[PDB]
Design a protein around this ligand. Sequence first.
Ligand SMILES: [Mg+2]
Ligand SMILES: [Mg+2]
Ligand SMILES: [Mg+2]
Ligand SMILES: [Mg+2]
Ligand SMILES: [Mg+2]
Ligand SMILES: [Mg+2]
Lengths: 111, 60, 96, 120, 79, 92, 61
Amino acid sequence: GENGRRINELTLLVQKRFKYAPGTIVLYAERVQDRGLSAVAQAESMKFKLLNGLAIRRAAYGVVRYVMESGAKGCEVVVSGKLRAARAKAMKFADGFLIHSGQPVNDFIDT
Amino acid sequence: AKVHGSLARAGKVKSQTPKVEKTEKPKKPKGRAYKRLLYTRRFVNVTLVNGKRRMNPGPS
Amino acid sequence: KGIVLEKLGIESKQPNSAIRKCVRVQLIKNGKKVTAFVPNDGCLNFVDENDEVLLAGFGRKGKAKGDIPGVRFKVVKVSGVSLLALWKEKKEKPRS
Amino acid sequence: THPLFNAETKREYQDLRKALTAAITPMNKKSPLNYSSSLAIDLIRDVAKPMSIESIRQTVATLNVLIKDKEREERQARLARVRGGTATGGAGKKKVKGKTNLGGAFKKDQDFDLDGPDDF
Amino acid sequence: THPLFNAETKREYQDLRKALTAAITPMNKKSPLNYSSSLAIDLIRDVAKPMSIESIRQTVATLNVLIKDKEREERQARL
Amino acid sequence: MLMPKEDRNKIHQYLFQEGVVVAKKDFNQAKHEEIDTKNLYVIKALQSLTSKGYVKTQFSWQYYYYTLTEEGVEYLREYLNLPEHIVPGTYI
Amino acid sequence: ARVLITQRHIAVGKQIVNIPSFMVRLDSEKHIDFAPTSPFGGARPGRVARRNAARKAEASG
RNA sequence: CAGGGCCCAUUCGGGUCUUGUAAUUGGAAUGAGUACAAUGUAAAUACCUUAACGAGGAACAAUUGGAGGGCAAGUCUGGUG
Ligand SMILES: [Mg+2]
Ligand SMILES: [Mg+2]
Ligand SMILES: [Mg+2]
Ligand SMILES: [Mg+2]
Ligand SMILES: [Mg+2]
Ligand SMILES: [Mg+2]
């Protein structure tokens, strides 16, 4: 905001709740890198697209295309829910390959 | 078989439809002029395009 | 042309749940009894009784048309006024 | 004393309806409680009196659409002041929902022949 | 145009309503066909569009009970 | 809600000064911190303020975070009869 | 061109033609010109021009 | 009011050279129709010709069937259930 006005109020909120002394707690903003290689960002971009009113496959093919263009080894998005009927249904949209088991998943898959 | 039935229900939905009055439009031209405006909307002014030309797009 | 005998509520075949609103008519030239389907929405409220209806086939060359079991004809005019003109309120019926 | 319009066709009928609406309406600008009860309720029933079973049913149906649309407009107005989503905002515990733009993908549900090659 | 009538009281409105009922209704007897078309229904919408939400339900309910007795009436007539 | 005039002015003046207010969702706690009034008062009054577009809330593990808006700085100012631009949150 | 043909301001020989599908015979191409008994070929203006001249002569007198 | 290189080598400046929208305005043009007259005809009517009148947006206002597929044309909005 203007001269940190929102982040000023966000500092003020965290001091009152966590009982910190005024001045001992400070907030910084930071540009995320590698935005396609972020599962929490890509899910939240997907979440806003459906709320803004984008077509559902458009978004889901759009986000999996974006991540693979960003240099990911494999991307995978699942949409589960009632689409047009009372009987719900899960869609899977994938590209690349992904591993599933072992210690490697902890280090390379972000979910 | 069941040749009887509930004949009291005939015209149910046609009576239940809310009467929505037509808006009044400018006249469309008739004849050679109408083919002229169709040609103009299809071939020279192709203002609306999605990479494939559609004639009655729903609001995307 | 024929004379309406009664109004029938023939139910459609499977899977289709409806009542099809036909009439029985006695033909004027033959005296033969015939079932005719009154086509549109609400149009059975024109075809009440002892009327002169005009009938045509449905187009299936003598076969029963749809889910409607066993009718082969449709109503075209009632009392000298066509049924779509009555349905679109272009015209209106005589008293009898 | 109504000699003003002896119109005999629908198109000619149109002028009468407009003029009567011009006549009747402005009477709501003054005395609105007097308008709604004494005159609107009973003139409507009296003009509904001629018409047949079907026609009155359309009139009831038309009126219900009026109700629905009006409530819709009012609901725009109440949630204009309140900054976020539903009434009472963040206190509310109830969020504002959205709509799934399906396109035409899932009606009478099937598999999609038209896959999309590229995404904007 | 509309030169005859002004707003004083509920009583005088009943005069105006009754006069209006006199004026409008013979148009059904000359062409009933136009009567169920543009003239009657769309006026009723037009006079109810500047009103209050509860009042239009009161408008609906009176129509609803009116049609109901007629449904009885024709049933008796047929039987 | 029926709370005396003096503590609504406490809640409203405290809100102006801090630009924010945090409130644990504990009814019957009966003693707010940062404010000597009942916890139920500060929740309910800020529920009345949010329902007129002056303050916005977030629940966030039972804590009710309130930050007042641009509507909030004009309304409250009219309310407290304080000098213009006397809001701490607004001016760095 | 269609409305000029149809409204009789065109003459392929010395004869008016008001048929747009006329299929001219390539020694008649030299002779397509305006009709003599018309405006745009001259000697009397036409209905709306004579009316407007009538109004301006009315205002002059 | 929504658009191309370029004259410019004067950064988001006129945009010539056009293409279409306009609760922006202008005159021109004409028949459908009406009608002296003549022609037409056995006598007429009409056609062909022609004085006089006859236009412009609520006027002199094109329908009939359709918009899942076959088979052109809805990623609509209300109603019924
Ligand atoms: Mg599951
Ligand atoms: Mg079958
Ligand atoms: Mg149509
Ligand atoms: Mg249809
Ligand atoms: Mg349709
Ligand atoms: Mg097709």
